[PDB]
Amino acid sequence: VVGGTDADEGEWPWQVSLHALGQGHICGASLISPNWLVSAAHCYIDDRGFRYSDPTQWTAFLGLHDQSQRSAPGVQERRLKRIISHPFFNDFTFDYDIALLELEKPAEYSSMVRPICLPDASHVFPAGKAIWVTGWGHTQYGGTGALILQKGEIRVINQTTCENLLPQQITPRMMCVGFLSGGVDSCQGDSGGPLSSVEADGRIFQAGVVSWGDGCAQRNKPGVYTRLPLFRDWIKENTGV
């Protein structure tokens, strides 16, 4: 996250860190039930030197605050049993960039580990609404990852504006969130994490999944996120949640 601040310990108890064995933190995810996480499909694509699509190559850390203190009290370590990437995911356009990760053993809810709420299919996160992005990704484009979880406040951008800022690249599964002036944005390593939106009684709902961007925090280049309401039924069908 560029332009953000250190989160308070336990402030985003649904935020998860996914590590590929021997590689460190690669992407984020969100806890949605005792057995399931939501993340981005693009994080689990094989490359010539590493099988990121193999669930056995991963470790999820729940209740994590500082990447250098992964054994701190309250942090829970879990392996993955399965990765369900959306069947329509396109690795060139990044359309349908969403995946479901099944924990090998259930998470234990605590003050530091708690699921985020999922929005109903009909819910609209309105243009202009302030929402939060969190993660351990780079704090500057081409920069370095954050040891301490970062948070940043960004706003939903009108879809027509989004489509015009990134021509021939924005599908209806995507949403631009950030600022036309730049400044605050997600970045490498934040992928897969949740957008957190404070709703009517203060409860937090997941508005989207960190997906991609042209650089980070640049003017007229807000980050692109996968929308969540559109996938409510798909999540229910595949997880029971």
Swiss-Prot record:
Effect noted on mutating H42A: Abolishes catalytic activity
Please state what the protein is called.
Suppressor of tumorigenicity 14 protein
Q: Which residues are glycosylated?
A: N158
Q: Where is the active site?
A: H42, D97, S191
Where found, per UniProt?
Membrane
- The SS bond pairs are C27-C43, C162-C176, C187-C216
Q: Where is the Peptidase S1 domain?
A: 1-240
Q: Which disease is it linked to?
A: Ichthyosis, congenital, autosomal recessive 11: A form of autosomal recessive congenital ichthyosis, a disorder of keratinization with abnormal differentiation and desquamation of the epidermis, resulting in abnormal skin scaling over the whole body. The main skin phenotypes are lamellar ichthyosis (LI) and non-bullous congenital ichthyosiform erythroderma (NCIE), although phenotypic overlap within the same patient or among patients from the same family can occur.
Q: Which residues form the signal peptide?
A: none
Indicate the quaternary assembly.
Interacts with CDCP1. May interact with TMEFF1. Interacts with iripin-3, a serine protease inhibitor from Ixodes ricinus saliva. Interacts with iripin-1, a serine protease inhibitor from Ixodes ricinus saliva.
* Whole sequence portion shown: 615 to 855 of 855
What's the stated role of this polypeptide? Exhibits trypsin-like activity as defined by cleavage of synthetic substrates with Arg or Lys as the P1 site. Involved in the terminal differentiation of keratinocytes through prostasin (PRSS8) activation and filaggrin (FLG) processing. Proteolytically cleaves and therefore activates TMPRSS13.
Its lineage opens with: Eukaryota, Metazoa, Chordata, Craniata, Vertebrata
Question: What family, per the record?
Answer: Belongs to the peptidase S1 family.
